[PDB]
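Input (Endoglucanase):
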Amino acid sequence: ASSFEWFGSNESGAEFGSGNIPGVEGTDYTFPNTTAIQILIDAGMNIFRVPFLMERMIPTEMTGSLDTAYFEGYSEVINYITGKGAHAVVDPHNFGRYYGTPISSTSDFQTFWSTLASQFKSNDLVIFDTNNEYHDMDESVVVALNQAAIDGIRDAGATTQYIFVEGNAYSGAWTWTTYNTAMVALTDPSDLIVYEMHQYLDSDGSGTSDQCVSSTVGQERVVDATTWLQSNGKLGILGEFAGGANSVCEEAVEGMLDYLAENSDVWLGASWWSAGPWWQDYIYSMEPPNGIAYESYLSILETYF
Ligand SMILES: *[C@@H]1O[C@H](CO)[C@@H](O[C@@H]2O[C@H](CO)[C@@H](O)[C@H](O)[C@H]2NC(C)=O)[C@H](O)[C@H]1NC(C)=O
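Output:
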């Protein structure tokens, strides 16, 4: 059948216009298009990661109540995905920050996650992602926040769902052993932790350029993370990756995924960045019918599922 347990795409829109909070749906942000998601499901994709903003989901304080309107729009997309049998990743796309300030309260963060996870606790196709790309924070705080999120999710009775944890330094695969070895200490009573890493192929790994360093830089940038997963008996998932519409990037993406698939005993899969209805001519857009990456990469990616 497939190279991985999971292979799919990010579905972007609800995290857009982050300078406008709460902002206005249809003006500053939008929710993903379930008809466009269905096209990717029909192509074989079975996981979709859906960014949102913490401040739009639970405004004012992390310990507060949900914004009903934003939660209902967001959960309609989540429930469409799981209703079709695919896994849906709930991603607070917040960089370890709440209203621009680094999160430093494990107890506040745990409460945020109990409030949110309580709304999905009976849906075993939901996956929780503690936060997108912690960075420029103390490593012990990042590990503690991941643990606080796990604690809040399980305490809320959401015990059947995988939890994607993310490291410091933008959770990059290529720097994982440099910054994030202390993430090994995370515990989960359900034993469903997956280490979510991101890997881009431009010079700074930021994923802002359609040019890759070389045709082999992808494989080179995931070797150490793979060794770490295998050495420590952990599982991983490449929750973001992309490359530009050129042969060097396509071969780099292929070589990276080939290596992950060769090591599928620890790599559970990968999800492209990104699809969604508001990307226009984005260098990495996986949105049908005409996204640049949909045109250039979809048939390459279908090799793996
Ligand atoms: C959601 O995605 C669907 C599928 O791509 C979009 O539907 C296309 O819409 C155009 C214009 O309305 C039609 O001419 C096509 O026939 C549709 N294609 C398919 C395969 O149904 C739809 O416009 C998107 N909705 C948004 C972006 O709000």
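Residues 1-305 form one domain.
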